[PDB]
Design an enzyme around this catalytic site. Structure first.
Site, PDB file in Angstrom:
ATOM      1  N   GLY A  11      36.169  31.686  41.953  1.00 23.98           N
ATOM      2  CA  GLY A  11      35.958  30.219  41.902  1.00 23.98           C
ATOM      3  C   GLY A  11      35.468  29.902  40.498  1.00 23.98           C
ATOM      4  O   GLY A  11      34.712  30.722  39.929  1.00 23.98           O
ATOM      5  N   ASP A  70      33.304  39.082  42.652  1.00 25.36           N
ATOM      6  CA  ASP A  70      32.236  39.277  41.654  1.00 25.36           C
ATOM      7  C   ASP A  70      31.304  38.065  41.730  1.00 25.36           C
ATOM      8  O   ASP A  70      30.394  37.888  40.897  1.00 25.36           O
ATOM      9  CB  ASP A  70      32.906  39.554  40.316  1.00 25.36           C
ATOM     10  N   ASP A 134      40.818  34.875  39.279  1.00 27.10           N
ATOM     11  CA  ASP A 134      40.138  34.215  38.135  1.00 27.10           C
ATOM     12  C   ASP A 134      41.115  33.269  37.402  1.00 27.10           C
ATOM     13  O   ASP A 134      40.779  32.151  37.051  1.00 27.10           O
ATOM     14  CB  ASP A 134      39.552  35.289  37.242  1.00 27.10           C
TER      15      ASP A 134
END
Length: 155
Positions: A11, A70, A134
């Protein structure tokens, strides 16, 4: 055919608030599903939760999942807060609703339907699928189409 459901999420947000988006890759059944949407005004934390949410809500049966991300906000929620928040009725120490309660409750509902195994990756050391999330997250935030309804400067 994979024996476990594999999910990857990311995000992104350009401001606080600003336009943002998410990217989620889901390996379910014999396919790889890709989800990604941009929002006109939201936050990075809200997008990281949205990624996880849309991916899980796609599963139509009780599955065995391995979710890789992550996202630190997700991590802290999952590992330190969510438990205590359920016991406290989704309120802070000063008895106000938690921040982003809309999404965390939404997420919590999705998580209780599955056996989940969390894999916290380091931003610079994930898998190709994390890097691709990403990329999706960023592309989406540059062409936002939806409104992030639960967003509050507020509560």
């Amino acid at each position: 055919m994979l024996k476990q459901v594999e999910i990857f999420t990311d995000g992104s947000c350009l401001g606080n608030p600003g336009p943002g988006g998410y990217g989620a890759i889901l390996r379910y059944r014999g396919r790889e599903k890709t989800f990604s949407a941009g929002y006109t005004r939201t936050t990075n934390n809200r997008m990281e939760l949205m990624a996880a949410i849309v991916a899980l809500e796609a599963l139509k049966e009780h599955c065995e999942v391995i979710l890789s991300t992550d996202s630190q906000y997700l991590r802290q929620g999952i590992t330190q807060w969510i438990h205590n928040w359920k016991k406290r009725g989704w309120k802070t120490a000063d008895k106000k609703p938690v921040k982003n309660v809309d999404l965390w409750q939404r997420l919590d509902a999705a998580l209780g339907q599955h056996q989940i195994k969390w894999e916290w990756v380091k931003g610079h050391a994930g898998h190709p699928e994390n890097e691709r999330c990403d990329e999706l997250a960023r592309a989406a935030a540059m062409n936002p189409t939806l409104e992030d309804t639960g967003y509050q400067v507020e509560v």
